[PDB]
Scaffold this motif. Structure first.
Motif, PDB file in Angstrom:
ATOM      1  N   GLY A   1       0.877  -1.194   0.080  1.00  0.00           N
ATOM      2  CA  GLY A   1       0.054  -0.186   0.012  1.00  0.00           C
ATOM      3  C   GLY A   1       0.985   1.034  -0.002  1.00  0.00           C
ATOM      4  O   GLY A   1       2.199   0.951  -0.061  1.00  0.00           O
ATOM      5  N   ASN A   2       0.176   2.417   0.109  1.00  0.00           N
ATOM      6  CA  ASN A   2       1.238   3.666   0.140  1.00  0.00           C
ATOM      7  C   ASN A   2       1.757   3.960   1.418  1.00  0.00           C
ATOM      8  O   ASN A   2       0.737   3.748   2.291  1.00  0.00           O
ATOM      9  CB  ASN A   2       0.258   4.758  -0.365  1.00  0.00           C
ATOM     10  N   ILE A   3       2.861   4.441   1.695  1.00  0.00           N
ATOM     11  CA  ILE A   3       3.330   4.701   2.884  1.00  0.00           C
ATOM     12  C   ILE A   3       2.398   5.873   3.611  1.00  0.00           C
ATOM     13  O   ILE A   3       2.052   6.555   2.820  1.00  0.00           O
ATOM     14  CB  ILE A   3       4.575   5.339   2.899  1.00  0.00           C
ATOM     15  N   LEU A  44      20.261   0.264   9.441  1.00  0.00           N
ATOM     16  CA  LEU A  44      18.953   0.473   9.725  1.00  0.00           C
ATOM     17  C   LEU A  44      18.317   1.030   8.342  1.00  0.00           C
ATOM     18  O   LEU A  44      17.556   0.561   7.781  1.00  0.00           O
ATOM     19  CB  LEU A  44      18.555   1.446  10.756  1.00  0.00           C
ATOM     20  N   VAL A  45      19.014   2.025   7.780  1.00  0.00           N
ATOM     21  CA  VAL A  45      18.552   2.638   6.408  1.00  0.00           C
ATOM     22  C   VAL A  45      18.884   1.555   5.599  1.00  0.00           C
ATOM     23  O   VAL A  45      18.029   1.536   4.594  1.00  0.00           O
ATOM     24  CB  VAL A  45      19.503   3.984   6.457  1.00  0.00           C
ATOM     25  N   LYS A  46      19.840   0.911   5.350  1.00  0.00           N
ATOM     26  CA  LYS A  46      19.871  -0.277   4.567  1.00  0.00           C
ATOM     27  C   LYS A  46      18.697  -1.214   4.546  1.00  0.00           C
ATOM     28  O   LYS A  46      18.024  -1.069   3.438  1.00  0.00           O
ATOM     29  CB  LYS A  46      20.995  -1.018   4.941  1.00  0.00           C
ATOM     30  N   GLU A  47      18.200  -1.558   5.564  1.00  0.00           N
ATOM     31  CA  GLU A  47      17.035  -2.344   5.618  1.00  0.00           C
ATOM     32  C   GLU A  47      15.889  -1.805   5.209  1.00  0.00           C
ATOM     33  O   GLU A  47      15.200  -2.333   4.428  1.00  0.00           O
ATOM     34  CB  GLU A  47      16.806  -3.140   7.200  1.00  0.00           C
ATOM     35  N   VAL A  48      15.485  -0.603   5.836  1.00  0.00           N
ATOM     36  CA  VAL A  48      14.658   0.065   5.526  1.00  0.00           C
ATOM     37  C   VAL A  48      14.400   0.239   3.993  1.00  0.00           C
ATOM     38  O   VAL A  48      13.409   0.015   3.587  1.00  0.00           O
ATOM     39  CB  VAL A  48      14.350   1.302   6.198  1.00  0.00           C
ATOM     40  N   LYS A  49      15.343   0.672   3.237  1.00  0.00           N
ATOM     41  CA  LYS A  49      15.236   0.938   1.799  1.00  0.00           C
ATOM     42  C   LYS A  49      15.063  -0.259   1.243  1.00  0.00           C
ATOM     43  O   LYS A  49      14.125  -0.437   0.524  1.00  0.00           O
ATOM     44  CB  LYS A  49      16.693   1.419   1.406  1.00  0.00           C
ATOM     45  N   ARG A  50      15.873  -1.372   1.908  1.00  0.00           N
ATOM     46  CA  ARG A  50      15.491  -2.860   1.070  1.00  0.00           C
ATOM     47  C   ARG A  50      13.946  -3.266   1.017  1.00  0.00           C
ATOM     48  O   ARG A  50      13.470  -3.979   0.216  1.00  0.00           O
ATOM     49  CB  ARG A  50      16.436  -3.850   1.888  1.00  0.00           C
ATOM     50  N   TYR A  51      13.298  -2.913   2.272  1.00  0.00           N
ATOM     51  CA  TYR A  51      11.938  -3.462   2.265  1.00  0.00           C
ATOM     52  C   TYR A  51      11.226  -2.603   1.503  1.00  0.00           C
ATOM     53  O   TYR A  51      10.618  -2.921   0.575  1.00  0.00           O
ATOM     54  CB  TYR A  51      11.441  -2.986   4.012  1.00  0.00           C
ATOM     55  N   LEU A  52      11.403  -1.225   1.466  1.00  0.00           N
ATOM     56  CA  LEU A  52      10.769  -0.190   0.651  1.00  0.00           C
ATOM     57  C   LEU A  52      11.084  -0.469  -0.951  1.00  0.00           C
ATOM     58  O   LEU A  52      10.253   0.037  -1.836  1.00  0.00           O
ATOM     59  CB  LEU A  52      11.281   1.282   0.788  1.00  0.00           C
ATOM     60  N   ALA A  53      12.197  -1.264  -1.161  1.00  0.00           N
ATOM     61  CA  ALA A  53      12.612  -1.446  -2.542  1.00  0.00           C
ATOM     62  C   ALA A  53      11.518  -2.385  -3.354  1.00  0.00           C
ATOM     63  O   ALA A  53      11.991  -2.921  -4.357  1.00  0.00           O
ATOM     64  CB  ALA A  53      14.045  -1.868  -2.647  1.00  0.00           C
ATOM     65  N   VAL A  97       6.289 -11.177   0.387  1.00  0.00           N
ATOM     66  CA  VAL A  97       7.628 -10.988   1.118  1.00  0.00           C
ATOM     67  C   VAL A  97       8.711 -11.060  -0.249  1.00  0.00           C
ATOM     68  O   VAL A  97       8.548 -11.902  -1.242  1.00  0.00           O
ATOM     69  CB  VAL A  97       8.071 -11.983   2.175  1.00  0.00           C
ATOM     70  N   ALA A  98       9.505 -10.175  -0.061  1.00  0.00           N
ATOM     71  CA  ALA A  98      10.387  -9.862  -1.325  1.00  0.00           C
ATOM     72  C   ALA A  98      11.221 -11.023  -1.838  1.00  0.00           C
ATOM     73  O   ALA A  98      10.973 -11.669  -3.074  1.00  0.00           O
ATOM     74  CB  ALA A  98      11.596  -8.889  -0.802  1.00  0.00           C
ATOM     75  N   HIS A  99      11.940 -11.788  -0.944  1.00  0.00           N
ATOM     76  CA  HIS A  99      12.621 -12.836  -1.274  1.00  0.00           C
ATOM     77  C   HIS A  99      12.552 -14.251  -0.192  1.00  0.00           C
ATOM     78  O   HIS A  99      12.369 -13.737   1.024  1.00  0.00           O
ATOM     79  CB  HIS A  99      14.213 -12.639  -1.509  1.00  0.00           C
TER      80      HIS A  99
END
Lengths: 335, 335
Positions: A183-185, A263-272, A299-301
């Motif tokens: 959904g949209n953030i 954290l930023v890594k992960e967050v982006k990863r989820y958002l990606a 789930v992404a992967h």
């Protein structure tokens, strides 16, 4: 009688805990054969023993192999009795893991229960006890499961000293959770938790987050020094269909910028990806949806944990999970 | 610069090797950060050093962390030079591993090469060097890759002293490997390798195979005692669309029938699904098909190694793998 291979999948540990819960949920006894075969510490370790003592108590079990070096375990459950339980792990012990061993069983106990555990609440490498309350407790409530976890005192690895307590109620009826598009953030919020650590580390960690994200709130949370030295940083992504929250526990020799940068890594990863849930919430949804007999999420992967959780689940229950990795997203569904 | 987490997936080892081959194939340097975090032996070990020394010789690399206990490594490759190499691992060293780290790079070398490796050819816990010649070399040839591995002397774990040598030729053009249905069996053949063990273990071993299978040939292969005491039993499943072969290395304290029975478990496990390829061959086909830019194959269940190999490949290359777990068979395809 069910026999599980301890070196299977990621290699024991989680296999033991998913087995415990299932073996109690179901009643089917089981036998893990090569606990932590290759791990540095070869088999059952104090935490696992505590996972096991808690399990062999909530359900009057019969165990064979519950010794500090055991690579073999025979566990024969009994009746999951409801009630006021209090377990105490050490310092390296994560309340999170005891609680995710015992609480599922209690979903089917003859009555409501309260579990209080002591030990580590925030461990650098692992999920914090907050994930329970602020992240999955709600998906659970939606699958028809009723749990309420309160963090009462934090224990920051390697200190110990934390106290977490969960209230459960035997599941009445199960629902089918149907997640997909995130959904949209709707809003992102960063939060830092300091206990015995200076307000310049929080600010620095916050800043980094504000560096790539538009936070609706930047919060700094202060806990008594009593809570030992600790720093945990989290970013929440309240999207439309779901609310996720990612964490990164500050380490001894890790900088405010490094911690925040993980954290930023992960967050982006989820958002990606369009995926509603993260690799870890995914790992947790496998069991409850199995009990529920249907449901799915994207789930992404597919992760290696997912794979093994889905195995153990299917080893104790009449369910079929299907993973369809279509277009950078993976649809995990039941049958 | 590519950063890889060593505790990711199964937990290092393979990540290291898939990272090297890719890093040289591609040129992109990288950094593994927690090499073997939890394993008994915490980071880089002699074998891995050899993998790393061989790699950083085929391509004139720049390494940082190449020490016997290292949990961190930095690798900056150069131009993959073709030529006659000779590496020598210990006794616990598996030529197979060195060969699978180096050989992919050499498909892209400026010229043809030959790689000779010494050490263990038949290890109880791991794949024999024969798997390369009798099982994957052909799939490779179909992919357009040209490699030829001769086993020249066996080295049975724990002895050592084996010699395996492979001839390669830079890949001209790549092909798309489209595998799926195993097709109908075309013939099975059991084989026993004795080196300093009696011809009663071979028979007993063969018998058991003939016990559940209809072997077109029952071959017993005798090696000079020189080759140390060794026993390896294998069964080939030549189906229509693919030929596979499974092996079980007789152990110290393992009887002829136990050895034989392990092999029968696997062969059946294989046979129990329409999937062209076995978990291990699947693991090996990830990389080549990725360099190929397309292709697919079916495998019973996605393994945890499959997951991680796919990860690393996708980390260095512009490829998307898709796993579709449909009807007890998972379809791994590229994009």
């Amino acid at each position: 009688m069910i026999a599980l291979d301890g070196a299977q999948g990621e290699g024991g540990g989680q296999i033991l805990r998913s087995a415990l819960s299932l073996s109690m949920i179901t009643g089917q006894p089981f036998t893990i054969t090569s606990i932590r075969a290759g791990r540095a510490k070869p088999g059952l370790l104090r935490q696992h023993l505590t996972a096991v003592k808690a399990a062999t108590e909530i359900c009057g079990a019969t165990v064979e192999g519950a010794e500090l070096g055991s690579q073999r375990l025979l566990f024969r459950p009994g009746t999951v009795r409801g009630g006021d339980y209090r377990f105490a792990i050490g310092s390296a012990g994560s309340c999170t893991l005891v609680l995710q061993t015992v609480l599922p069983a209690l979903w089917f106990a003859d009555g409501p229960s309260r579990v209080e555990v002591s030990g580590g609440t925030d461990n650098p490498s692992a999920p914090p006890a907050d994930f329970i309350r602020r992240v999955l407790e709600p998906l659970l409530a939606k699958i028809g499961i009723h749990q309420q976890t309160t963090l009462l005192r934090h224990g920051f690895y390697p200190a110990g000293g934390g106290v977490v307590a969960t209230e459960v109620s035997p599941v009445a009826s199960f629902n089918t959770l149907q997640l997909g598009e995130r959904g949209n953030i709707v809003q992102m919020r960063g939060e830092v938790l300091l206990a015995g650590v200076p307000r310049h580390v929080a600010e620095r960690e916050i800043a980094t987050l504000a560096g790539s994200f538009s936070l609706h709130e930047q919060n700094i949370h202060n806990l008594p020094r009593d809570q030992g030295p600790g720093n945990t940083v989290s970013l929440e992504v309240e999207s439309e269909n779901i609310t996720e929250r990612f964490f990164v526990v500050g380490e001894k020799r890790v900088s405010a910028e490094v911690v925040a940068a993980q954290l930023v890594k992960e967050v982006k990863r989820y958002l990606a990806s369009t995926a509603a849930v993260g690799e870890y919430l995914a790992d947790q949804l496998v069991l409850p949806m199995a009990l529920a007999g249907a449901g799915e999420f994207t789930v992404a992967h597919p992760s290696c944990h997912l794979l093994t959780n889905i195995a153990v689940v299917e080893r104790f229950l009449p369910v079929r999970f299907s993973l369809i990795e279509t277009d950078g997203v993976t649809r995990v569904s039941i049958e």
